[PDB]
Design a binder for this molecule. Structure first.
Ligand SMILES: Cc1ccccc1-c1cccc2c(CCCOc3cccc4c3CCCC4)c(C(=O)O)[nH]c12
Ligand SMILES: Cc1ccccc1-c1cccc2c(CCCOc3cccc4c3CCCC4)c(C(=O)O)[nH]c12
Length: 152
């Protein structure tokens, strides 16, 4: 599965470099993956700053203490992503909260749960939104959407 293997890479690398504080060198320059991670860094870091309150509140509410609580995250994700509208905004918000949660997993000494968490995000993202992802040219459409430079 090309669109899954790709999503899992962008989602895995973002959550990892966010939790660590330093960038790992993803794919190849100019490709969908490279541009998608650079975009996700730009728009997603903003989402975590702008929505820090709501993110602190959802994290407390979710009360993720261990590995079990990480695995059980697929349930609330399925609930939320099977509802409302589909747009890249929601997709970037979903990945930004996963980077926020991944930072917490580090502070609570559950670093190992991060890649499993990333896996769970890709699984929910594809099972609830793949027809829309295909129709949108996947990570190429994502990149194109947040490309605001050639409008004039
Ligand atoms: C504030 C909001 C505005 C717009 C877009 C998104 C969000 C939003 C963000 C994050 C989570 C939620 C939730 C779920 C609340 C926690 O629910 C659970 C917790 C643990 C297990 C389970 C669940 C529910 C399913 C069963 C298993 C709802 C919601 O219910 O409307 N909205 C959310
Ligand atoms: C911004 C915002 C404003 C006001 C009040 C609340 C919020 C809010 C808080 C937290 C997440 C979201 C999301 C992402 C979709 C739900 O994602 C999750 C739900 C449960 C667990 C996990 C996720 C993502 C991966 C980590 C594990 C949306 C959104 O799509 O509009 N809004 C959220």
């Amino acid at each position: 599965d090309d669109l899954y293997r790709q999503s899992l890479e962008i989602i895995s690398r973002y959550l990892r470099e966010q939790a660590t504080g330093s960038k790992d060198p993803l794919g190849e320059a100019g490709a969908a993956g490279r541009r998608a991670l650079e975009t996700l860094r730009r728009v997603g870091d903003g989402v975590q700053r702008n929505h820090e309150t709501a993110f602190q509140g959802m994290l407390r509410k979710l009360d993720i203490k261990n590995e079990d609580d990480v695995k059980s995250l697929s349930r609330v994700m399925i609930h939320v992503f099977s509802d409302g509208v589909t747009n890249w905004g929601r997709i970037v918000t979903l990945i930004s909260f996963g980077a926020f949660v991944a930072k917490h997993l580090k502070t609570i000494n559950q670093e190992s749960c991060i890649e499993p968490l990333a896996e769970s995000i890709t699984d929910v993202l594809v099972r609830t939104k793949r027809d829309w992802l295909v129709k949108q040219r996947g990570w190429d459409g994502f990149v194109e959407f947040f490309h605001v430079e050639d409008l004039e």
